[PDB]
């Protein structure tokens, strides 16, 4: 919080702690974190991150990724350095000045980008199953299976085109035999609503 | 930015009250004067019920395409904010006459949510 530095709310800290403690590491943690880190100094990021009680193993993986990114930054620049971004060797006043100067260098933004980059890997590791193993049960209602598949897809990591192809084909190719005929009959241009409402009775 | 309490409440409504016609006006209650970034942040936070979120995404896509065909001047994808800056949206909300990108985004999302309810 920059106004001069402003102390983070104990309410915000408690909310983030509870989110990490209860929500396992389901994907919605990534935006929720981004929700609570608007204009936050790297020192504030460290204060937010350290407070996590459990899941300490996963946090360590995060630490590793930071180093790598920091190394890459230290490779780019022969002026804050890689360790300066993490706040391990920067004062609060210096950090405030860096993103209060005109033009401001987005130290907070780049740190948050690094942390998000790590959290993506964390989520992928904690993801239960790969996108390819999602198959519909013979009696499973179609809506639940579609939602399960889409959650899993949101978990997995690939570029945009791979996701587009996955959505276009894999869902149909893995449905239960009863809805398979209806889906293949519907065509390639059917929207999701039509597909779900067609098998709604089943 | 929205308070964590307000954001948390919207999460609870989706999680607890499941999906019902009461949700849509409720979403309007917590979205008063919300920038497109705020709408995106509030939407992404929904953990469960991802299929309905996909349907809402498809509806947003169709509405944006229709707007783009119908017509810096906002484009079809400019409305959702996925191709815009916070500064540009702040200027549009602040420039006279204001051009309510938030209003049209809210209308599209409300229509999608009505469709979702009609599904259930």
């Amino acid at each position: 919080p920059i106004v001069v530095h402003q102390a983070i709310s104990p309410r915000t800290l408690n909310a983030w702690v509870k989110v990490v403690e209860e929500k396992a590491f389901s994907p919605e943690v990534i935006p929720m974190f981004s929700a609570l880190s608007e204009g936050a100094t790297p020192q504030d990021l460290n204060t937010m991150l350290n407070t996590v009680g459990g899941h300490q193993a996963a946090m360590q993986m995060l630490k590793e990724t930071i180093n790598e990114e920091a190394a890459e930054w230290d490779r780019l620049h022969p002026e804050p350095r890689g360790s300066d971004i993490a706040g391990t060797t920067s004062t609060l006043q210096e950090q405030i000045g860096w993103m209060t100067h005109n033009p401001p260098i987005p130290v907070g933004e780049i740190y948050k980008r690094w942390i998000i980059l790590g959290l993506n890997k964390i989520v992928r590791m904690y993801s239960p199953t790969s996108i390819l193993d999602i198959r519909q049960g013979p009696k499973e209602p179609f809506r639940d299976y579609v939602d399960r598949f889409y959650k899993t897809l949101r978990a997995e990591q690939a570029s945009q085109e791979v996701k587009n192809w996955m959505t276009e084909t894999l869902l149909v190719q893995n449905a239960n035999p009863d809805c398979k005929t209806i889906l293949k009959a519907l065509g390639p241009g059917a929207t999701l609503e039509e597909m779900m409402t067609a098998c709604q009775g089943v | 930015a929205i308070s964590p309490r307000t954001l948390n409440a919207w999460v609870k409504v989706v999680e607890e009250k499941a999906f019902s016609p009461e949700v849509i006006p409720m979403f309007s209650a917590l979205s008063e004067g919300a920038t497109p970034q705020d709408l995106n942040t509030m939407l992404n936070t929904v953990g469960g019920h991802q299929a309905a979120m996909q349907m809402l995404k498809e509806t947003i896509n169709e509405e944006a395409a229709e707007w783009d065909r119908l017509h810096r001047e906002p484009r079809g994808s400019d409305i959702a904010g996925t191709t815009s800056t916070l500064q540009e949206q702040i200027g549009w909300m602040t420039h006279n006459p204001p051009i309510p990108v938030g209003e049209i985004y809210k209308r599209w999302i409300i229509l999608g949510l009505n469709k979702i309810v009609r599904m259930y």
Binding site: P31, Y150, L153, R154, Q160, K163, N164, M166, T167 | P36, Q37, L39, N40, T41, L43, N44, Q54, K57, E58, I60, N61, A64, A65, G76, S77, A80, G81, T82, T83
Partner: peptide, 13 residues
């Protein structure tokens, strides 16, 4: 095609 399937809302291109 403002939002492709799978991508988060507001995700820049």
């Amino acid at each position: 095609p403002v939002l492709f399937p799978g991508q988060p809302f507001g995700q820049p291109p």
